[PDB]
């Protein structure tokens, strides 16, 4: 389960081309992806 | 629900706003029926 | 890598918009940008539909009418060094398939933002002044002209 | 015998190619990668101003800061922002004879490829599939490399003059009469660089007032030679006999550009096998189109000589045609013969004009005797003069390897390009991040390949290339297919929809 | 407009010109002299044994036993030819060992090697000079420089041969147009292409006076020293050593490995900031196979021998001004070249009136001289495709093999035959 859960992260690094980026550049992209998807759930629980 | 307002606010749209939008639809049509033509060559 | 390894093309920045799936992939970018703004909690819909129209026209003006040259070294000895992306498209040929799509899509985005904003006067003098800044450079008569010699070298 | 096309061409055997187009969902995902790379590349430029000193790059001298900057900064934006990230895939140094198994010197970077350093260990055996080594004449033993050491102990490495001067030995005349018989023409000339055979001889044929018809994907040497001539150049759709016939037709009726006069002549530049596409030119339809419009034909069979045909005479023999239908015949000695140099073959009237009016014949030095002796001995084995059968085996062992490898990959689910008889096989990878992962994965499984990116090709057509050889055994081909199957499952490379 | 009946008749009227024009059977060339065996000191040309004064190997080396025995050890461990374009598995460990060894010889920062001597400078110039740039070129530049300048579609201005008062006159006019449009003056690059020991004239350029003009007008120099590398200087470094100039003032220095090194190929040296840019744009470097391993191994041994004893450059210069001083007596021919050059010409005084007749007169001496024991050749040019065509001449080349007795007896043999053909 953990061996296949880590394989899905690998496929996410290839399609978004985050595979060929530095560790501090991956953290800048992952930060605003969870910040834009986390605030989109709070707006879906106030107008829905 | 808030959709009727939009359609009701469209009929009271100012004359100058409807003209501009109507003039933009005449440009699409004019530019949709155009040939290529490689700019200005050795004339 | 090296321009000319798998194609004769001396400048591959003139056939980029004619690619398969770039029209449907560029329309998904406008829709994706409108969904992240629509997620902001403390903003009304008319403000959302104006920020969507102004930000798209701002990025479309910089990437198509400001940045000039090519991002790689080509074998044509730097002939497109003083040109913008719009002027390079299709080697300067006017009214092609791609130069109609890029001229039409801002107009369509302007009709939806005028109806969702309820034809407000303050929102009409911002969206019309922003839409003009991206339609004027696309006229065939302004191919290579620089007003007051701005953005020339 | 098989079928005839309306363009006069007659085919004797079925000629079938395949160029599947990329799936809509897979095509839309490659633009996400390029944008994320462009947006992140603009943030590094602005970050290298009022921040990161980046003390590792090269700069101008202190006493030359007033001169106009040497380079244009925007150009080479892809070099420092996209190519630098995955550059450890290309300039790999090897330390053995390249064929079927090559040693590679291990190297590692600590600053994301900005700098490299050799650890010290060597990778013993790597299945070489990135070198042009058809027929496998690249060996450090045998009776072919034993005759080159005999002509190097009494001639020296290189000469010191030009052909028109005192640099025309007797060895240079022995190789030119032998190459004319092999090809089956009247005469031939040999030069010494393959890139210079095209760029220094195309401008001695055409000039101002002539027309050149070029193919969509012609080699850079063929494209640079036309640029120096002074003639007009128009390109036609790859292997399109309707697009070439329309360009040939309207060029005679309309005449020259502004003055509207008749052209002095018309020359069509085509090629044999195209390396990066894996496709074979349609000669029966070109040859019957240049006879109806009185044009001239320049054929560049650099990748097809020795590799195609039932004896190894190139693409002319592969179709069944006569070699007197081609005005000029160009080729090289580096792909199949394990040597270096080029040649041009044709009539005795064209080789007499090129012996006095070609740029290479009066300004550049001639071929080296040790490398001339290698071509003579390897070429004399294909024709079977040596008395052995080593030349009849290798030529027929390359056709078997090509049909078994190309058919086993297509039934796995990959998207392969080109003809079914092409010894170059281009596998298709579309995403930009897969270029740097398929290169590392192979070398980790102990296989060496070649990958090609965006500027080199089109934006949705990144690929890998798989040159095949007659020195690859069935055991090496089975081991290669196993490792390629595991890496295609790991990176999800099986894009084919019509399997 | 243009009906279908007329269209088909227009294609029947057309008749192209032949691929190659005829009317030959009189051309000066088209009769290569066959050499049987290696073109060594004692050679056999057209079935005749004679000492040659036509090959371009100055320090011997073509048949040095140590150079021959080192290219053999690289043939038995590598094969003959590479199979790649140097970007895909085409770079061996001998190519990286030859580039690093050349840079220590020149006391420079980095070097890059090509596989053909003609394309090293025909590919280096258009990598730095684009459409809008200005290049100041000497009028006596060789053919490779001209092709490299043509490939780079930039503005080209020629100046007289070896006079700086005419170069400075051209540099002051580009400066009068720098106030007519200052905004454009900051995006045009200025280059000065020059060369030490010009091959077409046998003269040496003034570098000391040309380096002071570079810093005063903000233009970059491109030195192309193919004939002086391994010849001039006290350590065979070149022209920059003959004067005393710091190697960092030149920008780029190109040469070939075919004249003093007795091998194949060319190289370019300089700082990293300028050298490492040709690896991704040099046309003949990215799309061509690399230099065969056995050819690169024969150049490293030559480099080792050159550095082992630098007293071989002092013997080649002392016998360079010995044959040049013994030829200043001929009545009919005039010597054209510096006294420290090993490749000076021998031109015709009082030209008849037509090139054709001139070439047949010089051919007569060349053919009548070979009959004894002296192999000479006349310079060959492409008359139609050249900017400034030099006059016909007989090239004379000096090495370190020829002895004193031979040098003196060859200078007297060219006098007796030339005083009986030109009177
Ligand atoms: C989550 C993020 C998803 C995607 C968001 C990023 C979208 C913006 C990316 C910017 C696209 C650039 C458009 C054209 C730019 C041209 O000036 C440029 C040089 O002139 N040409 C290319 O290289 C064009 C090469 C084609 C690249 C697409
Ligand atoms: C800021 C990013 C650009 C906005 C996304 C929507 C599309 C605009 C960018 C490209 C428009 C034409 C090039
Ligand atoms: C399955 C949908 C995935 C999300 C894709 C939508 C955004 C893709 C935009 C990538 C950047 C577009 C480049 C073209 C603009 C010139
Ligand atoms: C036309 C042409 N020129 C040059 C080359 C490469 O040059 P070389 O023969 O030196 O490898 C190839 C491959 C080619 O197809």
Numbering used by the authors:
A (entry chain C): 9 to 56
B (entry chain E): 8 to 50
C (entry chain D): 1 to 153
D (entry chain B): 45 to 543
E (entry chain A): 51 to 473
Q: How is this structure described in the published paper?
A:
To investigate the structural basis for SPT-ORMDL regulation by ceramide, we determined the structure of the SPT-ORMDL3 complex in the presence of excess C6-ceramide using single-particle cryo-EM. The structure of the monomeric SPT-ORMDL3 complex was resolved at an overall resolution of 2.9 Å. Compared to the cryo-EM map of the monomeric SPT-ORMDL3* complex we previously reported, several extra well-ordered lipid-like densities could be resolved between ORMDL3 and SPTLC2 in the cytosolic membrane leaflet. While the N-terminus of ORMDL3* was not resolved in the SPT-ORMDL3* structure, the N-terminus of ORMDL3 could be well resolved in the updated maps. Among the well-ordered lipid-like densities, the shape and size of one lipid-like density are consistent with a C6-ceramide molecule, showing one small polar head contiguous with two acyl chains. Close to the C6-ceramide density, we could observe two additional lipid-like densities, which might result from the acyl chains of phospholipids, sphingolipids, or other lipidic species. An alternative explanation for the two presumable acyl-chain densities is that they might arise from the average of C6-ceramide and endogenous bound long-chain ceramide (such as C24-ceramide). In the ceramide binding site, the polar head of ceramide makes five potential hydrogen bonds with the surrounding residues, including the side chain groups of Asn13 and His85 in ORMDL3, Tyr122 in SPTLC2, and the main chain group of Phe63 in ORMDL3 (left). The two aliphatic chains of ceramide are enclosed by numerous hydrophobic residues from both ORMDL3 and SPTLC2.
